[PDB]
Amino acid sequence: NLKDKILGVAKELFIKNGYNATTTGEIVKLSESSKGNLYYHFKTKENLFLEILNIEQSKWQEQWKKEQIKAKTNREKFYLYNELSLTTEYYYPLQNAIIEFYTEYYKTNSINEKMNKLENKYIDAYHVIFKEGNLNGEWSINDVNAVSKIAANAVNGIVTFTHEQNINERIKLMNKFSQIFLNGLS
Amino acid sequence: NLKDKILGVAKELFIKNGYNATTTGEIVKLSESSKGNLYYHFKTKENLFLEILNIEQSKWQEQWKKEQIKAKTNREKFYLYNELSLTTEYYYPLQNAIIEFYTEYYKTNSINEKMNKLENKYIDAYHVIFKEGNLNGEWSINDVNAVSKIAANAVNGIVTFTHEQNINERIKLMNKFSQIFLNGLS
């Protein structure tokens, strides 16, 4: 598939290299596609990017739901999600690329556009977990939406800023975090 | 000095045109130095940059030493340091060159190694706050080294992946997080 070929080489390079490091030229030489290809469903570069992001976001959200069963209580769901957040092959491996992409477009107003609906899925997982926990009486969070955002970002941090040290060490930290966070919620 | 002069000019250059565009040539001519002297001092642009980064870490620490006086108890220092981390990077010029540099050299262990020694220094702050916090019964943490790395990275998370939100909101979420976290240690 050509339309689904660009997306392939793209995600690949955006991960190995940064947002800038990888260029349209490089994709075209490994995916074979003139300017045209990139225009109907692939306008700009930040377009082909915001695309990949959504795909991955869904790939992750899906995997999460197909695996959250191994967790009976929401307290366990919180812990798990965070741990999985470290093992996955979806979305998280593009955080560095995102950090860049943002530090180099936070001017073009059409940024907080997708950067919005995207920030939703990103925190939705926590939103449910937290609200459901309220119903299930595991805790009582009145500012769910906030805690959701905080948890989501703190976790992204532990996943992103320690991406080079022993995976077991990581898993250990993340769990000690999840333990400390939930415990500060009541 | 002439070394100090290269670092100076280099910091500015990096700040004005980023890491990738700054050429050692520019650095050499503007610092009124020479390819040879610049080689003898840093060997490479990457090292030159890491060196600036080190000096920068120093200023940060020194600054934090003055600023933490406004914080009597360790609980307070935790709160302060976090907010500070968020607000100061909002308008930290080098930030862009750093993002660029990291998301382009974390592949190499040579460089990644040195960078971790740097990130460590950041973490030390939290280690001190937590250790002292123990000795004052503000809390009881027996795995300081861990809690420290965790805090550190969670905070980097909230600082990095939120940029796109009203500055106050960001500060609010941060302070909330410091509240939740600090409470889950009791």
Ligand SMILES: Cc1cc(N)c2ccccc2[n+]1CCCCCCCCCC[n+]1c(C)cc(N)c2ccccc21
């Ligand atoms: C003076 C001074 C003054 C201030 N007001 C100040 C304010 C805020 C922060 C530093 C400040 N400093 C000095 C700051 C010196 C900082 C040296 C930092 C070295 C480390 C970066 C590590 N890193 C890692 C590990 C992993 C990542 N995925 C990653 C992704 C994107 C970007 C960086 C990444």
